[PDB]
């Protein structure tokens, strides 16, 4: 208990797969990330908490409703246009015979494919360069081709490709933790927030103090940030923001988001998963400030693979999952910020945290 | 006050336009209906009340959230697959420069395009025959080409093309009423319900007693339904259900819905519109029984064009709109049932009410 799973990421929840598909260069800087549940699906829920969401099939995840499990969740760039990516994932799922059965014929299924989008328009240079159905299909096909327990690719990949967090380059990050029960809780985040992951007084990452021992040491940031390193970094970022606003037509992006999936193999009901999606947002708050503004499309999906029974008793057990859910999202955000590498395109200049502070 | 607007339909709300695009024959029986607000958009809200919804961009319509008006709502066949239609509408809206402004450049917009889908799969014979982006685009282009105050086409058109209500042919129906204030409230429904629009004891349409004087007389149904007419009708419908189940692979459709848009030119806040979308569902209940089951994806969007001020005073004024909202949806359902003509395809036999009772 209290240590990461084998690869410190979402796929430490057994049977979960992650696929990215992206387009970089020639005007493009965007992509799609798909989380694919194991065969049979997963109990799913959602908490859409940002004031500027762009979303699909969220109503279907209400605890009152018909469909009891789903197979895929889609995180995408392209703002609302990028929701087109989810159609490709639904098509693939139908081909696989995975969805709500609508007859005695087992090939006849309706896939419930929730999606959330983040705003990254123009960050490669070309405004109408957004994910489409083919790019979504590519992402789920990439997910399906991976084995169980495959390390998750972080950084400027999938939905994180064009992601920017408080002016710094954002991206995909992931983290896991093992509970005393043996259950794993984990998160994957695509971090494109308006607010800052960095304390403006010190340069320290807000989320870092929620880290487990040594988990960030591979990224090689100094344990203490010198005041003049922070001074140089603030100026460097301020000027990249100036230049970004210059290059861009209507200046810097006005819409932002952090998108996440939190997963566990602990068996949850849909309502319990809905609570977990809610508590996960608290972890976002600890890693980024401010969050959940009107400009933010922050969305957390929660999944349970239902492979381990939970066991005042059940309540305590669930509380451990809920608390972990927040912590893994906090840690996933820090990993996203650290895994990022800077970009410089006609649609934006966005240095990475490590470029400024390492 | 207390009479229909000029054409007794949704476009009696000035500036509202309706477009249908459908595909019939060669395996197909489906389509898309788009409600297009006038330039500048309309205040919008939603109440998703069915237990089996298939939906897009509903979170964006929460009263707490950023976007203050929208331009188009999409109702579609094809179940969840048909949500693909909304991408075509978003594309058209971008070309028109209509959406949330994301910069000083006015061409840079993000259209918020809510959608709801109904299950009509296989009703033309071909299972994978579902609306796509091109069909959605065609529907909004058709809407835009119409003048203000254009009569709404009812029957087996647009999203109503493949619609079935309690085994009878469903379709598109519409109705309006003028308030004492001079404001108009109106509804458009695509009626594909599991439950019955017909009282099984008598053959009378549940919604008929909510009708205004003479509004259904054009459809030429007898004022009184003879018991042996009802006997013949029940047997005829029972056998069409038998045959439909025979023809279909996994038998009769398992998912159902009634989709609607209610509109007014009375100025509403988003929260007031959300209340109106809620009270509209009561009108559905009066026209169809049962409704809002797990098998049902019932969704009502509410729109206000904001052209007439509302004026205990404001409360009374709103109550008149809320009560009207229910009534126009009840009446729209009856019009849908009466406007329908029967179908007989490899994917279903669905006689119309008038075929059985007129």
XYZ file of C-alpha atoms in Angstrom:
716
model
C 0.000 0.000 0.000
C 0.987 3.621 -0.660
C 3.320 3.000 -3.599
C 2.738 3.256 -7.351
C 1.696 0.319 -9.489
C 4.224 -1.268 -11.833
C 4.502 1.593 -14.352
C 2.926 4.373 -12.267
C 0.060 4.927 -14.695
C -3.479 4.182 -15.758
C -2.701 0.769 -17.237
C -1.649 -0.454 -13.765
C -5.396 -1.034 -13.446
C -5.437 -4.471 -15.085
C -7.147 -4.686 -18.486
C -7.158 -0.934 -19.116
C -5.501 0.173 -22.354
C -4.553 3.637 -23.573
C -4.072 4.728 -27.179
C -2.875 8.021 -28.643
C -3.071 9.327 -32.180
C -1.709 12.732 -33.105
C -0.771 15.026 -35.958
C 2.246 17.318 -35.703
C 3.771 19.532 -38.390
C 2.524 21.003 -41.638
C 0.165 23.284 -39.643
C -0.983 20.660 -37.125
C -0.516 20.181 -33.386
C -3.357 18.078 -32.034
C -4.552 14.600 -31.270
C -6.809 12.141 -29.521
C -6.395 9.881 -26.510
C -8.695 6.897 -25.984
C -9.037 4.904 -22.777
C -10.246 1.420 -23.632
C -11.789 -0.824 -20.976
C -11.193 -4.562 -21.099
C -13.659 -6.798 -22.914
C -16.999 -6.690 -21.085
C -16.584 -2.979 -20.442
C -16.310 -0.992 -17.244
C -18.725 0.796 -14.943
C -18.395 4.470 -15.829
C -19.428 7.865 -14.533
C -18.580 11.503 -15.150
C -18.280 14.848 -13.402
C -18.210 17.795 -15.782
C -17.039 20.705 -13.650
C -15.461 23.238 -15.977
C -17.578 26.199 -17.041
C -16.808 25.766 -20.733
C -17.201 22.083 -21.528
C -17.342 20.355 -24.904
C -18.772 16.925 -24.442
C -20.648 13.934 -25.779
C -22.811 11.194 -24.207
C -22.510 12.477 -20.667
C -26.249 12.051 -19.922
C -25.943 8.336 -20.666
C -23.557 8.041 -17.686
C -26.161 9.218 -15.157
C -26.666 6.546 -12.467
C -30.415 6.432 -13.233
C -29.937 5.400 -16.820
C -30.009 2.245 -18.900
C -26.474 1.414 -19.987
C -24.540 -0.327 -17.226
C -21.010 -0.319 -18.632
C -19.069 1.247 -21.509
C -15.918 0.325 -23.428
C -14.201 3.572 -24.409
C -13.763 7.162 -23.316
C -12.416 9.741 -25.756
C -10.316 12.789 -24.870
C -9.649 15.073 -27.812
C -8.181 18.317 -29.055
C -10.025 20.461 -31.583
C -12.528 21.948 -29.143
C -16.126 21.112 -30.136
C -15.028 20.158 -33.665
C -12.843 17.434 -32.179
C -15.931 15.625 -30.897
C -16.023 14.286 -34.485
C -13.255 11.921 -33.336
C -15.733 9.993 -31.188
C -17.675 8.845 -34.264
C -14.639 6.876 -35.431
C -14.337 5.180 -32.059
C -18.033 4.256 -32.109
C -17.544 2.782 -35.592
C -14.594 0.661 -34.453
C -16.524 -0.529 -31.397
C -19.453 -1.612 -33.576
C -17.070 -3.619 -35.788
C -15.779 -5.302 -32.611
C -19.317 -6.117 -31.425
C -18.816 -4.000 -28.311
C -21.765 -1.940 -27.098
C -25.273 -2.096 -25.704
C -27.001 -5.104 -27.265
C -29.987 -4.107 -29.377
C -31.281 -7.541 -30.345
C -30.820 -11.313 -30.266
C -28.282 -10.748 -33.052
C -25.006 -10.099 -31.181
C -23.505 -7.951 -33.974
C -26.222 -5.353 -33.369
C -24.846 -3.021 -30.707
C -25.005 0.662 -29.837
C -21.691 1.862 -28.395
C -21.982 4.565 -25.737
C -18.840 6.607 -26.303
C -18.445 9.570 -23.966
C -16.028 12.287 -25.021
C -14.593 15.545 -23.778
C -12.643 18.053 -25.823
C -10.007 20.687 -25.085
C -9.330 23.891 -26.982
C -6.035 23.821 -28.902
C -7.094 25.528 -32.111
C -4.395 26.990 -34.321
C -1.493 25.824 -32.174
C 0.178 24.156 -35.156
C -0.448 27.194 -37.367
C -3.546 26.014 -39.238
C -6.894 26.928 -37.686
C -9.078 24.177 -39.138
C -6.551 21.461 -38.237
C -8.648 19.404 -35.806
C -9.170 15.739 -34.977
C -11.646 13.853 -37.172
C -13.277 10.415 -37.091
C -10.203 8.798 -38.683
C -7.905 10.192 -35.981
C -10.235 8.911 -33.256
C -10.322 5.481 -34.870
C -6.524 5.490 -35.049
C -6.351 6.210 -31.311
C -8.629 3.344 -30.276
C -6.917 0.951 -32.714
C -3.622 1.992 -31.123
C -5.094 1.239 -27.682
C -6.355 -2.188 -28.699
C -2.955 -3.199 -30.131
C -1.214 -2.758 -26.763
C -0.887 -5.549 -24.187
C -2.243 -5.277 -20.645
C -0.013 -3.355 -18.237
C 1.722 -1.434 -21.017
C 3.481 1.770 -19.924
C 1.494 4.859 -20.859
C 3.178 7.310 -23.201
C 3.236 10.773 -21.623
C 4.044 14.239 -22.937
C 2.933 15.906 -26.163
C 0.962 12.930 -27.403
C -2.685 12.222 -28.159
C -5.016 14.820 -26.658
C -1.967 16.373 -24.984
C -0.255 17.160 -28.290
C -1.479 20.781 -28.439
C -2.097 21.197 -24.704
C -0.879 24.284 -22.830
C -1.055 24.824 -19.043
C -0.784 28.410 -17.784
C 1.336 29.251 -20.830
C 3.784 26.380 -20.324
C 3.547 23.326 -22.520
C 1.055 20.855 -21.104
C 0.390 17.320 -22.194
C -0.521 13.845 -21.047
C 0.444 12.653 -17.588
C -0.442 9.605 -15.549
C -0.015 8.157 -12.052
C -1.165 5.222 -9.943
C -1.238 4.073 -6.329
C -1.818 0.683 -4.709
C -4.242 0.533 -1.795
C -3.741 -1.572 1.335
C -6.525 -3.801 -0.045
C -4.406 -4.539 -3.127
C -6.672 -2.489 -5.386
C -5.086 0.037 -7.729
C -6.342 3.572 -8.348
C -4.892 5.588 -11.197
C -5.388 8.662 -13.335
C -4.583 9.952 -16.796
C -4.817 13.687 -17.489
C -4.618 15.905 -20.555
C -3.608 19.192 -19.005
C -4.619 22.345 -20.931
C -5.569 24.587 -17.992
C -5.961 28.372 -17.844
C -4.491 28.384 -14.343
C -0.936 27.659 -13.279
C 0.634 24.384 -12.189
C 3.468 26.476 -10.763
C 3.448 28.514 -7.556
C 4.183 32.034 -8.821
C 6.134 32.909 -5.640
C 8.627 30.028 -5.802
C 8.471 28.124 -9.101
C 7.551 24.941 -7.230
C 4.882 22.726 -8.809
C 1.735 22.928 -6.711
C 1.164 19.183 -7.036
C 4.674 18.118 -6.060
C 4.001 17.886 -2.324
C 1.370 15.210 -3.056
C 4.052 13.100 -4.748
C 5.177 9.692 -3.540
C 8.897 9.195 -2.722
C 11.204 9.603 -5.724
C 8.522 9.419 -8.406
C 9.599 12.650 -10.132
C 13.367 12.169 -9.749
C 13.753 10.829 -13.305
C 12.878 14.258 -14.733
C 15.973 15.785 -13.087
C 14.619 19.037 -11.636
C 16.626 20.583 -8.779
C 15.252 19.816 -5.309
C 15.406 23.549 -4.509
C 14.572 26.272 -7.049
C 16.921 29.255 -6.854
C 15.254 32.669 -6.799
C 17.125 33.830 -9.887
C 16.230 30.628 -11.752
C 12.609 31.495 -10.949
C 13.214 35.109 -12.007
C 14.674 33.995 -15.360
C 11.802 31.495 -15.852
C 9.039 34.042 -15.157
C 10.560 36.470 -17.668
C 11.063 33.726 -20.279
C 7.421 32.616 -19.935
C 6.098 36.189 -19.930
C 7.888 36.836 -23.233
C 6.672 33.567 -24.795
C 3.134 34.687 -23.885
C 3.744 38.080 -25.531
C 5.041 36.388 -28.675
C 2.238 33.815 -28.704
C -0.365 36.604 -28.543
C 1.470 38.355 -31.399
C 1.530 35.293 -33.661
C -2.065 34.339 -33.048
C -4.912 36.038 -34.835
C -7.299 36.583 -31.935
C -4.339 36.289 -29.595
C -3.889 33.686 -26.903
C -6.480 30.935 -26.523
C -9.603 31.944 -24.528
C -10.826 28.417 -23.767
C -8.951 25.930 -21.631
C -9.495 22.580 -19.943
C -8.077 19.728 -17.974
C -9.508 16.375 -19.064
C -9.008 13.225 -17.051
C -9.877 9.604 -16.564
C -9.594 7.999 -13.145
C -9.785 4.215 -12.950
C -9.738 1.448 -10.371
C -10.153 -2.310 -10.261
C -12.076 -1.946 -6.999
C -15.723 -2.761 -7.740
C -17.846 0.403 -7.743
C -21.478 1.017 -8.544
C -22.136 3.800 -11.040
C -23.071 6.159 -8.197
C -19.862 5.325 -6.348
C -17.940 5.963 -9.569
C -19.781 9.279 -9.938
C -18.620 10.222 -6.445
C -15.059 9.237 -7.424
C -15.214 11.441 -10.532
C -16.263 14.243 -8.168
C -13.528 13.738 -5.583
C -10.932 13.473 -8.371
C -11.599 17.161 -9.140
C -10.178 18.005 -5.709
C -6.857 16.563 -6.899
C -6.967 18.868 -9.898
C -7.461 21.790 -7.502
C -4.358 20.816 -5.551
C -2.235 20.748 -8.739
C -3.514 23.799 -10.603
C -4.724 27.234 -9.492
C -7.149 28.568 -10.433
C -9.312 25.802 -11.895
C -12.952 25.253 -12.869
C -13.326 28.765 -14.235
C -15.888 29.701 -16.919
C -13.057 29.451 -19.447
C -12.311 25.867 -18.358
C -13.902 22.677 -19.749
C -12.660 20.438 -16.930
C -14.096 16.933 -17.087
C -13.306 13.768 -15.159
C -14.518 10.321 -16.210
C -14.332 7.517 -13.645
C -14.072 3.825 -14.497
C -14.255 0.629 -12.436
C -13.253 -2.702 -13.975
C -15.145 -4.490 -11.168
C -12.484 -7.120 -10.516
C -11.949 -6.653 -6.759
C -14.666 -6.466 -4.141
C -14.467 -3.307 -2.028
C -14.099 -5.449 1.098
C -18.805 1.856 8.334
C -16.825 -0.908 6.644
C -17.852 -0.264 3.047
C -17.758 3.502 3.720
C -14.144 3.373 4.937
C -13.180 1.247 1.954
C -14.769 3.665 -0.479
C -13.220 6.633 1.301
C -9.769 5.161 0.630
C -10.582 4.961 -3.089
C -12.036 8.482 -3.117
C -9.018 10.006 -1.399
C -6.660 8.090 -3.716
C -8.639 9.327 -6.727
C -7.820 12.909 -5.868
C -4.173 12.131 -5.164
C -3.540 10.239 -8.403
C -4.997 13.109 -10.432
C -2.788 15.639 -8.583
C 0.219 13.458 -9.333
C -0.808 12.845 -12.968
C -0.917 16.603 -13.563
C 2.632 16.988 -12.217
C 3.793 14.176 -14.491
C 2.132 15.903 -17.469
C 3.977 19.137 -16.746
C 7.316 17.376 -16.247
C 6.956 15.041 -19.253
C 6.280 17.936 -21.626
C 8.784 19.283 -24.118
C 8.476 22.836 -25.459
C 7.011 23.843 -28.804
C 7.577 26.773 -31.135
C 5.183 26.961 -34.091
C 3.354 29.723 -35.992
C 0.422 29.210 -33.588
C 2.321 29.454 -30.290
C 5.554 29.456 -28.292
C 5.213 27.311 -25.170
C 8.347 26.330 -23.271
C 8.237 23.353 -20.926
C 8.652 23.541 -17.173
C 11.916 21.580 -17.387
C 13.290 23.911 -20.056
C 12.776 26.780 -17.598
C 13.676 25.102 -14.300
C 15.892 22.029 -14.895
C -54.662 34.607 -26.681
C -55.424 30.873 -26.628
C -55.276 30.256 -30.378
C -52.486 28.897 -32.580
C -49.991 31.110 -34.359
C -50.255 31.567 -38.118
C -49.209 28.045 -39.170
C -49.649 26.271 -35.821
C -45.983 25.318 -35.547
C -42.515 26.098 -34.294
C -41.775 28.753 -36.910
C -44.634 30.878 -35.508
C -41.901 31.964 -33.094
C -40.429 34.687 -35.313
C -36.942 34.016 -36.702
C -36.975 30.285 -35.955
C -36.322 28.025 -38.942
C -36.683 24.268 -39.309
C -34.896 22.045 -41.818
C -35.271 18.342 -42.569
C -33.035 16.017 -44.532
C -33.891 12.360 -44.973
C -33.072 9.189 -46.857
C -35.810 6.758 -47.862
C -35.536 3.645 -50.027
C -32.698 1.380 -51.069
C -32.423 0.140 -47.445
C -32.830 3.540 -45.767
C -35.499 5.118 -43.572
C -33.935 7.858 -41.483
C -33.095 11.514 -41.285
C -32.188 14.646 -39.397
C -34.146 17.677 -38.245
C -32.368 20.922 -37.361
C -33.904 23.852 -35.508
C -32.029 27.003 -36.447
C -32.267 30.136 -34.303
C -32.206 33.547 -35.948
C -28.908 35.368 -36.376
C -27.523 36.236 -32.936
C -28.683 32.896 -31.571
C -31.150 32.003 -28.856
C -30.968 31.330 -25.137
C -31.090 27.553 -24.811
C -31.518 24.887 -22.169
C -32.202 21.167 -21.992
C -33.931 18.535 -19.889
C -32.822 15.001 -20.685
C -35.410 12.797 -19.000
C -35.441 9.491 -20.843
C -33.494 6.616 -19.319
C -31.696 5.767 -22.552
C -30.460 9.030 -24.029
C -28.012 9.606 -26.872
C -26.809 13.149 -26.724
C -24.176 15.762 -27.427
C -23.195 19.092 -25.812
C -25.818 18.967 -23.095
C -23.378 20.042 -20.336
C -22.705 23.269 -22.229
C -26.383 24.209 -21.727
C -26.129 24.204 -17.920
C -27.132 27.630 -16.543
C -23.765 27.934 -14.747
C -21.740 27.717 -17.911
C -19.998 30.038 -20.333
C -21.918 30.063 -23.601
C -24.941 32.348 -23.424
C -26.753 31.483 -26.650
C -26.601 28.871 -29.417
C -27.689 28.763 -33.059
C -28.763 25.196 -33.813
C -30.211 22.109 -32.183
C -29.999 18.753 -33.946
C -32.524 15.916 -33.686
C -31.440 12.759 -35.465
C -32.156 9.139 -36.248
C -29.396 6.539 -36.191
C -29.200 6.203 -32.411
C -25.720 7.098 -31.100
C -24.215 6.752 -34.590
C -26.508 9.530 -35.784
C -24.745 12.000 -33.495
C -22.246 12.138 -36.395
C -24.814 14.403 -38.083
C -24.052 17.188 -35.605
C -20.484 17.524 -36.913
C -21.838 18.654 -40.282
C -24.005 21.281 -38.625
C -21.037 22.568 -36.613
C -19.034 22.798 -39.850
C -21.763 24.808 -41.583
C -22.081 27.121 -38.577
C -18.333 27.795 -38.605
C -18.522 28.707 -42.311
C -21.324 31.144 -41.415
C -19.271 32.701 -38.594
C -21.874 31.632 -36.042
C -20.627 30.422 -32.667
C -18.806 31.420 -29.511
C -16.144 33.962 -30.470
C -12.638 32.705 -29.758
C -10.633 35.784 -30.708
C -10.594 39.307 -32.136
C -10.838 37.597 -35.533
C -14.606 37.193 -36.079
C -14.238 34.113 -38.325
C -12.847 32.176 -35.356
C -15.858 30.660 -33.609
C -16.718 27.487 -31.729
C -20.308 26.424 -32.429
C -22.085 24.752 -29.513
C -24.370 22.284 -31.256
C -26.498 20.185 -28.918
C -27.999 17.011 -30.336
C -30.266 14.169 -29.336
C -30.757 10.932 -31.223
C -33.550 8.377 -31.537
C -33.243 4.681 -32.295
C -34.541 3.754 -35.759
C -31.899 1.257 -36.818
C -32.737 -1.134 -39.626
C -36.180 0.302 -40.314
C -35.376 0.734 -44.006
C -33.852 -2.750 -44.212
C -30.160 -1.868 -43.947
C -28.687 -1.846 -40.442
C -25.774 0.542 -40.955
C -27.960 3.087 -42.776
C -27.653 6.038 -40.380
C -27.349 9.812 -40.622
C -23.844 11.184 -41.202
C -22.244 14.637 -41.199
C -23.399 15.296 -44.780
C -27.031 14.569 -43.885
C -26.823 16.909 -40.889
C -25.333 19.638 -43.058
C -28.127 19.128 -45.586
C -30.710 19.612 -42.826
C -29.286 22.904 -41.559
C -28.772 24.185 -45.121
C -32.423 23.322 -45.754
C -33.386 25.290 -42.628
C -31.376 28.344 -43.631
C -32.953 28.445 -47.116
C -36.468 28.890 -45.698
C -38.023 32.293 -44.967
C -39.259 33.314 -41.518
C -42.715 32.005 -40.621
C -42.508 29.114 -43.077
C -44.921 26.237 -42.406
C -43.171 23.266 -40.833
C -43.264 20.021 -42.779
C -44.714 17.253 -40.607
C -44.906 13.480 -40.951
C -42.209 11.021 -42.001
C -39.567 13.662 -42.571
C -36.215 14.517 -41.019
C -35.686 12.819 -37.663
C -39.261 11.528 -37.920
C -38.570 9.542 -41.091
C -37.964 6.229 -39.277
C -39.905 7.090 -36.114
C -42.384 4.633 -34.585
C -44.710 5.342 -31.627
C -46.135 2.331 -29.776
C -45.927 0.329 -33.005
C -47.784 2.905 -35.104
C -45.855 5.114 -37.471
C -44.555 8.180 -35.674
C -42.941 11.241 -37.140
C -42.563 14.983 -36.850
C -45.352 17.084 -35.394
C -45.607 20.702 -34.355
C -47.978 23.120 -32.611
C -48.089 26.685 -31.320
C -50.185 28.917 -29.083
C -50.371 32.689 -28.642
C -50.343 34.035 -25.096
C -52.460 36.948 -23.866
C -49.196 38.936 -23.783
C -48.780 38.409 -27.536
C -45.856 36.031 -27.050
C -45.882 32.726 -28.912
C -44.944 29.349 -27.438
C -44.486 26.382 -29.732
C -43.113 22.870 -29.957
C -41.690 20.467 -32.505
C -41.510 16.759 -31.667
C -39.981 13.679 -33.259
C -42.120 10.955 -31.764
C -40.497 7.497 -31.488
C -41.893 6.425 -28.102
C -42.130 2.955 -26.553
C -45.473 3.877 -25.006
C -48.782 4.480 -26.734
C -50.289 7.724 -27.992
C -53.605 5.872 -28.117
C -55.859 4.969 -25.194
C -56.034 1.170 -25.441
C -59.643 1.122 -24.152
C -61.110 3.492 -26.754
C -58.680 4.260 -29.589
C -58.787 7.956 -28.689
C -55.485 9.855 -28.816
C -54.429 10.697 -25.278
C -53.347 14.187 -26.329
C -56.526 15.086 -28.198
C -58.349 16.564 -25.205
C -55.559 19.161 -24.902
C -56.293 20.298 -28.462
C -57.519 23.757 -29.397
C -60.825 24.047 -31.331
C -60.738 22.444 -34.784
C -56.966 22.085 -35.040
C -57.077 18.371 -35.921
C -60.146 18.502 -38.187
C -58.033 18.596 -41.368
C -56.861 15.019 -40.740
C -60.451 13.738 -41.054
C -60.714 11.293 -38.143
C -64.240 10.506 -36.906
C -65.295 12.485 -33.826
C -66.357 9.205 -32.179
C -64.430 5.937 -32.585
C -66.701 2.914 -32.992
C -65.860 -0.087 -30.819
C -65.472 -2.375 -33.819
C -63.232 0.155 -35.582
C -61.071 0.017 -32.449
C -61.287 -3.791 -32.438
C -60.152 -3.972 -36.083
C -57.350 -1.437 -35.403
C -55.974 -3.292 -32.358
C -55.833 -6.549 -34.328
C -54.243 -4.851 -37.359
C -51.544 -3.270 -35.161
C -50.954 -6.477 -33.191
C -50.308 -8.340 -36.454
C -48.006 -5.613 -37.821
C -46.006 -5.965 -34.585
C -45.829 -9.751 -35.062
C -44.633 -9.304 -38.639
C -42.168 -6.562 -37.699
C -40.605 -8.832 -35.056
C -40.406 -11.598 -37.683
C -38.661 -9.437 -40.287
C -36.187 -7.923 -37.880
C -33.076 -9.754 -36.803
C -33.149 -9.071 -33.070
C -36.861 -8.402 -33.383
C -38.604 -5.154 -32.588
C -36.540 -2.140 -31.548
C -35.531 -2.093 -27.843
C -34.663 1.611 -27.645
C -37.158 4.408 -28.109
C -37.418 8.159 -27.630
C -39.416 11.300 -28.038
C -37.238 14.280 -28.961
C -38.526 17.824 -28.850
C -37.745 21.488 -29.100
C -39.937 24.047 -27.370
C -39.471 27.694 -28.307
C -40.816 31.108 -27.388
C -40.127 34.730 -28.235
C -40.763 35.643 -24.598
C -37.408 36.604 -23.071
C -36.152 33.873 -20.730
C -32.938 33.467 -18.802
C -31.180 30.135 -19.270
C -32.541 28.922 -15.923
C -36.069 29.915 -16.911
C -35.576 28.072 -20.203
C -34.323 25.049 -18.251
C -37.532 25.129 -16.219
C -39.521 25.330 -19.476
C -37.694 22.290 -20.878
C -38.716 20.522 -17.659
C -42.387 21.494 -17.722
C -42.577 20.558 -21.419
C -42.012 16.921 -20.375
C -45.370 17.044 -18.583
C -46.989 17.636 -21.982
C -45.277 14.532 -23.304
C -46.758 12.595 -20.375
C -50.253 13.765 -21.268
C -49.851 12.573 -24.886
C -48.051 9.262 -24.429
C -48.231 6.520 -21.793
C -45.936 5.252 -20.501
C -43.031 7.647 -21.040
C -39.564 8.283 -19.598
C -38.825 4.588 -19.217
C -35.276 3.160 -19.196
C -35.813 2.265 -22.853
C -36.653 5.895 -23.689
C -34.181 8.646 -24.672
C -36.653 11.499 -24.174
C -35.044 14.918 -24.483
C -36.497 18.414 -24.621
C -34.501 21.469 -25.686
C -35.938 24.898 -24.876
C -35.166 28.074 -26.809
C -35.955 31.756 -26.247
C -35.358 34.289 -29.022
C -35.477 37.080 -26.406
C -37.618 39.451 -28.460
C -40.461 40.135 -25.996
C -40.061 41.105 -22.367
C -41.921 38.775 -20.001
C -43.930 41.736 -18.702
C -45.765 37.697 -8.301
C -45.887 39.533 -11.622
C -42.900 37.910 -13.310
C -43.839 34.567 -11.704
C -47.360 34.649 -13.172
C -45.959 35.595 -16.563
C -43.487 32.736 -16.513
C -46.147 30.323 -15.297
C -48.191 31.092 -18.421
C -45.191 30.201 -20.597
C -44.473 27.047 -18.585
C -48.049 25.801 -18.799
C -48.162 26.596 -22.535
C -44.887 24.712 -23.019
C -46.476 21.515 -21.799
C -49.622 22.043 -23.856
C -47.834 22.727 -27.143
C -45.771 19.554 -26.748
C -48.928 17.498 -26.040
C -50.499 18.961 -29.163
C -47.340 18.510 -31.275
C -47.321 14.797 -30.440
C -50.934 14.444 -31.613
C -50.053 16.237 -34.843
C -47.099 13.865 -35.351
C -49.348 10.833 -34.986
C -52.012 12.257 -37.304
C -49.561 13.547 -39.938
C -47.880 10.150 -40.273
C -48.377 7.802 -43.193
C -47.709 4.069 -42.823
C -44.588 2.236 -43.942
C -43.889 -1.326 -45.021
C -40.208 -2.156 -45.535
C -37.929 -5.143 -44.848
C -37.147 -3.557 -41.456
C -40.716 -2.967 -40.250
C -44.455 -2.716 -40.884
C -45.919 0.329 -39.139
C -49.405 1.486 -40.091
C -50.456 5.043 -39.305
C -53.171 6.003 -36.856
C -55.303 7.399 -39.693
C -54.939 4.200 -41.712
C -56.437 2.336 -38.743
C -59.017 4.852 -37.513
C -59.976 7.298 -40.307
